Design a protein around this ligand. Structure first.
Ligand code: GTP
Ligand code: GDP
Ligand code: MG
Lengths: 54, 436, 281, 430, 136, 77
């Protein structure tokens, strides 16, 4: 149930939480896959990638 | 009295559903006609996947959806034409053409109604329905759009019924299209709050596995589909075969997902050896479980060594023994290069099943008396989200290709909320990964 | 409104309006076809607004929506003139044109009257009730400021001065009464007929009409029939600043409860809001 | 299903369509009598895309031939496979344009075009579900460059949602057979950039060069040029007609290939093309196909793609091949040539597979590439345009029947702005 | 319709649409009666029930017989030099067209435009003064 | 019909004759205020009527594309 009051006039303006942080990421953009076999063409890399997770 | 319903959308979804339904049929001994294996001769296990028609043949509890008719035409012309019900292979007229907006707002809404009608017509038959499996290539317009639409529609039509999404995210550097970052991000924004369990199925890792192990230097999609089908069978054998320690579909969301926002896992399968040397090593439980945890054997192109582990669920099928399994678990725990998160003292769930893995004629794997399938939730999967985020922002800096989605009924802002949701997911993951 | 300055209400020749202090656009109106209201008063805790009209009827309207909550019929012969609400708001006091003061016990179920129907030959113009709500002072048109016990409806000791009186008011936390009248003079009075200072706030023909005070009796603002309005220091009767530029006879001047401003209402349709001086806080 | 209709106008368009229909009929196994003589079911699985069925079991192409002179169609009807075309589809004028864009776009063509637009609307209404419209024409001739583009505008403004592409033959100044190429070329481009959803440019100079250098055959001919361009044309829609690992129709190609609305001018390539002496020597593999595909000389345009940076590329493979090696080759080519690929669009190569190769070949490759090297065509066209325009040469022929210099000035300014906006994106960096 | 659109400062597409809409007078004509008396200047053309007739301005006709058209009929009257010397702006300035409508004051038009725009965009409130000028 | 009754007749039914003429259109020159749909249509016709007269003043004759054609005859001598 609602009661009509003078104080109820001028409804409150809406205040949301303004913004969230755009990002947080601690991994590099370029991270070579561990066991990839797609880069070793024309290069002496025993047919496997770094494989050490570097 | 337990059934699961399969949903296959997208070209990749169809091409993997065909492979998995070959495997299920071979497992249950059904012929392509759908009957018993001719007149040469009923354990009642097929009820998990199949349903008896009342006179003879079996109809699978699966539905295929597509907007481009092609694959539906070939599956209706092939040898399994009489197997599937004529009116569960839903075909559209115009494809979305790698456009997520087209498949989510423009043309998929006219087909989703027929799909829901068919899903109801299949669900009312079942009485002890465990849940739904869904397959969709996420890097495609119609696949992503219909996958989304079906997920939110089912979430409100059924509610608490469990759904498992086996999606194929694009590789870090190898890709076929040029616009898939947009639709992949939008689809992830869709599925994050709607999918109970999601599993990584990136293609680069499977290519590498096939190259290193199967010694196949010219592999195609069929081998990848066969491997994925083997994973499916190893996961779902527990419901239809007797075992010492059984695990149901409901015994996943209670053991593998520590918090509701964290429900993405990555898989591994062992052993994966070509038959030319397959049994020239003993294939013991210890070595197969070590190969399962080997970082080079991940089904997705992610390195778990960069992060911690929260959950590991392993299903052994074949000739395993609980004492040997526990002895292997002890060694894995003692190994130093693999570290678990602090607030999880024990993180292993183990299931045992006695049905040995099968070989499919024309296959590549060898039929072995022991195999293990591993699904892990670990913190290292943030890297793929980070690199896709960088790829997406590289595109969106200059608002390229945005018109192709703006002109298809969806407004400008939806990219912002998807990016924010990805950021929030990264926040949650890296907050959970920190020790107390 | 009591202890509230964000909104303020004005009665008209036909219709009540409400206004916002920060921005002066209309917020709401109550419309009556061919009647005029006197002494519209807010009642605390958001209850209905009360007005008395020409025909003698009293009407109460809800704040949010323009629907009447109740009506008092045949309250006074020629129209209610002054209204005052007690703090606990079970009773309303009203004044008629033909010299009467009446008390009505409002109640959510019913409206009842228990006035002694006192005699007062002049029409009222201002009725006040002190803080403890026990005592009620009423000003006459014929020259008497009568104080009422309001408990036994008796003790006719009334202040004597020969003019057409105007607004009266209690001093904040005191027994002193500040009153104005047709004579161009502001007169302090006491319960013992004591007159501390006797102002003579005289224009040529400018009859001081309205008065308002601070919560602490530092100064009081006075508005006359002339166009100019001024505020006097209470302790000593010396002008501090002045207010002009109005057209016609300013009739009422109120001070917001927060006292950041003063509003004044002009007989020809003009509303003036005044930025109060800084060094009165 | 998802069928398209063909419309060709002018002598050049008629010659291109004559060979293209021969090629497609040969690939589908259709005899010159319209009788089915194929060997597999797949030759009838998706025959509706181009052929309509008639009583008696015969087929008719859904192509509309238009011209202002009857000689070209009178000559082509007598050629092989000439009886397939429905005679009602031929619409012809009795005056001709004389290589004047004003004649071929304003006076006689507009009163002719009612019948051809009406037959086009019957053709579109009859078929179940449209996919789009395809046009072949040359910009060096007045009548073709006028009716072609005006019909483009009409059909686009009538079916705004269906896809629309044109094979445009642009006049190279080295081999120019008329004196009025720049005028009508610029005028046609002015509205072609406005209406054409997709435009693919072909150069006679480049055709001569590739025929002499790659095939090394003594006597090039317009028949050989038509054969090459027809193979290129069929390579685009092969996957729409046949199964494959990853089908990609014209809509998917357009979505994946244009980053912005006003860059829809493309350059195309075909592989393999092996010399006479070396058909027995060369080995058909994916690496060989890719290295010939990315060769500058294999191009059918005189623009050198190494003068600019590739916005994007798209490749249609035909034949049976595992997608892993294809993806490997595309990635290797992209990594080895970082200088020629603009950086803010990483992984800008689209790949698609169709498992049915051309008849007589085991593998084939069709290429379409959006790159900044095409700007020099427009630059040289504008150069000759202003060189012949500053003296107001031959302007009376145009101005005598509706033209004012304001239209020419506006077209020049619009094409110059097109060049400028095409060239800033080359220098754009992230 | 390009010169007409330029003279009216209107769109080429909209002026073409206006022509295409108006040329649909045959629909009105097919209905019984409805005689069309359309003028638009020198030619006065009348359409009865199904009968059509026309008239021309007598002065305009006399201008045609003013026998000076021997130069206009031939294309070789010009010395063929001024085709590139004379600019179209100069030719269009002396052309009869563009003189139908008066040219307003360019300064005045946007002065009024932005002036009224500011006035109305911030004419919302009249109460605020902040600068009184009591005495004057 | 007086060339204006046609104006109101065509403006009366928009469904029968939908087009850009039915509503006002912005000009290319901002210095000019917009016209009404009916007024701009009359202005367009006045402009065309003058265009045809100044073209007919030369040896060149003008035609409407679906409504007649303005020509002249030369008997010669
Ligand atoms: N693992 C795997 N992925 C596939 C296969 N086929 C297609 N894909 C993936 O699907 C992506 C493109 O989507 P498609 O499956 O071809 O088609 P779609 O999902 O229906 O979406 P559209 O192309 O818009 O029609 C490709 O980038 C592939 O990565 C497959 O057989 N196996
Ligand atoms: N590929 C090809 N090009 C042609 C053919 N005939 C003419 N052309 C080219 O088209 C240009 C002239 O086009 P034109 O005949 O005037 O076009 P039309 O006016 O529409 O008939 C020349 O520069 C030729 O190079 C042909 O049969 N095949
Ligand atoms: Mg697809």
């Amino acid at each position: 149930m609602e009661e009509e009051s003078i104080y109820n006039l001028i409804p409150k303006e809406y205040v949301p939480p303004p913004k969230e942080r755009r990002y947080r990421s601690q991994y590099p953009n370029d991270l070579p896959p561990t066991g990839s076999t797609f880069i070793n063409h024309t290069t002496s890399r025993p047919g496997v990638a770094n494989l050490a997770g570097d | 009295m337990r059934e699961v319903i399969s949903i296959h959308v997208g070209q990749g979804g169809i091409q993997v559903g065909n492979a998995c339904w070959e495997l299920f049929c071979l497992e249950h001994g059904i012929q392509p006609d759908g009957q018993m294996p001719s007149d040469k001769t009923g354990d009642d296990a097929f009820n998990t996947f199949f349903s008896e028609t009342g006179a003879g043949k079996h109809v699978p509890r699966a539905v295929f959806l597509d907007l481009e008719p092609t694959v539906i035409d070939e599956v209706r012309t092939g040898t399994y034409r009489q197997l599937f019900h004529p009116e569960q292979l839903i075909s559209g007229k115009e494809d979305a053409a790698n456009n997520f907006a087209r498949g989510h707002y423009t043309i998929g809404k006219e087909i989703v109604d027929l799909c829901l009608d068919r899903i109801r017509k299949l669900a009312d038959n079942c009485t002890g329905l465990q849940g739904f499996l869904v397959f969709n290539s996420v890097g495609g317009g119609t696949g992503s759009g219909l996958g989304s639409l079906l997920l939110e529609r089912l979430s409100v039509d059924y509610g608490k019924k469990s759904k498992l999404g086996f999606t194929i995210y694009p590789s870090p550097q190898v890709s076929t299209a040029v616009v898939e970052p947009y639709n992949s991000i939008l689809s992830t924004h869709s599925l994050l709050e709607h999918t109970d369990v999601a599993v990584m199925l990136d293609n680069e890792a499977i290519y590498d596995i096939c190259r290193r192990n199967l010694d196949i230097e010219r592999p195609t999609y069929t081998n990848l589909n066969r491997l994925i089908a083997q994973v499916i069978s190893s996961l779902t054998a527990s419901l239809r075969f007797d075992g010492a320690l059984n695990v149901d579909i409901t015994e996943f969301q209670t053991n593998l997902v520590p918090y509701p926002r964290i429900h993405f896992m990555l898989s591994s399968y062992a052993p994966i050896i070509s038959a030319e040397k397959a049994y020239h090593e003993q294939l013991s439980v210890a070595e197969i479980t070590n190969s399962a945890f080997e970082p080079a054997n991940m089904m997705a192109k992610c390195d778990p060594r960069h992060g911690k582990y929260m959950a590991c669920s392993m299903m052994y099928r074949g000739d395993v023994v609980p004492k040997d399994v526990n002895a292997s678990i002890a060694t894995i725990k003692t190994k130093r290069t693999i570290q678990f998160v602090d607030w999880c003292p024990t993180g292993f769930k183990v299931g045992i099943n006695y049905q040995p893995p099968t070989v499919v004629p024309g296959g590549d794997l060898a039929k072995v008396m022991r195999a293990v399938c591993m699904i892990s939730n670990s913190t290292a999967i943030a890297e793929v989200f980070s690199r896709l985020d960088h790829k997406f922002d590289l595109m969106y800096a200059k608002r390229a290709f945005v018109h192709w989605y703006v002109g298809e009924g969806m407004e400008e802002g939806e990219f912002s909320e998807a990016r924010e949701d990805l950021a929030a997911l990264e926040k949650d993951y890296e907050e959970v990964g920190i020790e107390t | 409104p009591y202890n509230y300055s964000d909104v303020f209400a004005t009665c008209s020749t036909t219709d009540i309006r409400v206004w916002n202090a920060r921005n002066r656009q209309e917020l709401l109106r109550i419309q009556v076809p061919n009647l005029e209201c006197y002494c519209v008063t807010f009642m605390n805790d958001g209850k209905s607004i009360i007005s008395g009209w020409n025909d003698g009827k009293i009407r109460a309207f809800l704040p949010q929506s323009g629907k009447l909550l109740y009506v008092i019929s045949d309250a006074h012969i020629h129209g209610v003139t002054a209204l005052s609400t007690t703090s606990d708001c079970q009773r309303i006091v009203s004044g008629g044109s033909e010299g009467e003061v009446r008390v009505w016990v409002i109640n959510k179920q019913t409206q009842v009257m228990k006035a002694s129907m006192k005699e007062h030959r002049g029409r009222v113009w201002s009725i006040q009730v002190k803080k403890n709500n026990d005592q009620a002072v009423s000003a006459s048109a014929d020259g008497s400021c009568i104080i009422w016990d309001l408990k036994t409806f008796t003790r006719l000791m009334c202040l004597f001065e020969s003019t057409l009186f105007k607004q009266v008011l209690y001093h904040p936390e005191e027994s002193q009464l500040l009153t104005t009248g047709s004579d161009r003079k502001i007169t302090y009075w006491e319960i013992y007929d004591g007159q501390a200072i006797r102002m003579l706030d005289g224009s040529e023909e400018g009859e001081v009409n309205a008065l308002s005070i601070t919560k602490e009796g530092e100064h009081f603002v006075s508005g006359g029939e002339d166009k100019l309005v001024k505020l006097w220091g209470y302790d000593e009767g010396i002008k501090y600043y002045s207010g002009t530029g109005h057209s016609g006879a300013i009739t009422r001047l109120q001070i917001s409860p927060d006292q950041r401003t003063v509003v004044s209402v002009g007989a020809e349709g003009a509303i003036f809001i005044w930025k109060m001086p800084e060094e009165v806080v | 299903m998802r069928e398209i209709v063909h419309i060709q106008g002018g002598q050049c368009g008629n010659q291109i369509g004559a060979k293209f229909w021969e090629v497609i009929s040969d690939e589908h196994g259709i005899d010159p009598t319209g009788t089915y003589h194929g060997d597999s079911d797949l030759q009838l699985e998706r025959i509706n895309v181009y052929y309509n069925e008639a009583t008696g079991g015969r087929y008719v192409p859904r192509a509309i031939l238009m011209d202002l002179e009857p000689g070209t169609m009178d000559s082509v009807r007598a050629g092989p496979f000439g009886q397939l075309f429905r005679p009602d589809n031929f619409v012809f004028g009795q005056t001709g344009a004389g290589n004047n864009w004003a004649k071929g776009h304003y006076t006689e063509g507009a009163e002719l075009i009612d019948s051809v637009l009406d037959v086009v609307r019957k053709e579109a209404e009859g078929c179940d579900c449209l996919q789009g419209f395809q046009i072949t024409h040359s910009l060096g001739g007045g009548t073709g460059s006028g009716m072609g583009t005006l019909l483009i505008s009409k059909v686009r403004e009538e079916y705004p949602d269906r896809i629309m592409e044109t094979f445009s033959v642009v006049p190279s100044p080295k081999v120019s057979d008329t004196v009025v190429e720049p005028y009508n070329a610029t005028l046609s481009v002015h509205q072609l950039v406005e209406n054409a959803d997709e435009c693919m440019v072909i150069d006679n100079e480049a055709l001569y060069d590739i025929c002499f250098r790659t095939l090394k055959l003594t006597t090039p001919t317009y028949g050989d040029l038509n054969h090459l361009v027809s193979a290129a044309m069929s390579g685009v829609t092969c996957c729409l007609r046949f199964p494959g690992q990853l089908n990609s129709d014209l809509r998917k190609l357009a979505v994946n290939l244009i980053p912005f609305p006003r860059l829809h001018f493309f350059m195309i390539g075909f592989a393999p093309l092996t010399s006479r002496g070396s058909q027995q020597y060369r080995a058909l593999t994916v690496p060989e196909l890719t290295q010939q595909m990315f060769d500058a000389k294999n191009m059918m345009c005189a623009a050198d793609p190494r003068h600019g940076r590739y916005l994007t590329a798209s490749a249609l493979f035909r034949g049976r091949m595992s997608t892993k090696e294809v993806d490997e080759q595309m990635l290797n080519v992209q990594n080895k040539n970082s200088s020629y690929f603009v950086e803010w669009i990483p992984n800008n190569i689209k790949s698609s597979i169709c498992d049915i190769p051309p008849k007589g070949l085991k593998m084939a490759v069709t290429f379409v590439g959006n790159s900044t090297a095409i700007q020099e065509m427009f630059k040289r066209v504008a150069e000759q345009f202003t060189a012949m325009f500053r003296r107001k040469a031959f302007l009376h022929w145009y101005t005598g029947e509706g033209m004012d210099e304001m239209e020419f000035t506006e077209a020049e300014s619009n094409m110059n702005d097109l060049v400028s906006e095409y060239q800033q994106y080359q220098d754009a960096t992230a | 319709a390009g010169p007409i659109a330029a003279s009216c400062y209107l769109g080429k597409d909209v002026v073409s649409s206006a022509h295409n809409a108006f040329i649909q007078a045959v629909s009105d004509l097919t209905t019984l009666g409805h005689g069309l008396n359309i003028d638009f200047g020198f030619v006065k053309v009348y359409v009865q029930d199904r009968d059509l007739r026309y008239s021309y301005n007598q002065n305009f006709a006399n201008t045609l017989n003013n026998k000076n058209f021997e130069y206009r009929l031939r294309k070789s009257d010009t010395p063929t030099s001024e085709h590139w010397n004379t600019t179209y702006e100069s030719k269009w300035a002396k052309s009869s067209l563009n003189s139908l409508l008066k040219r307003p004051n360019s300064n005045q038009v946007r002065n009024y435009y932005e002036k009224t725009l500011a006035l109305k965009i911030m004419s919302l409130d009249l109460s605020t003064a902040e600068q009184t000028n009591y005495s004057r | 019909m007086n060339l204006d009754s046609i104006f109101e007749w065509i403006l009366k039914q928009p469904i029968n004759y939908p087009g850009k003429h039915q509503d006002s259109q912005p000009r290319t020159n901002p210095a000019y205020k917009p016209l009404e749909a009916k007024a701009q249509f009359h202005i367009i016709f006045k402009a065309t009527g003058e265009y045809i007269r100044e073209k007919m003043l030369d040896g060149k004759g003008v035609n409407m594309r679906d409504f007649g054609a303005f020509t002249f005859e030369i008997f010669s001598d």
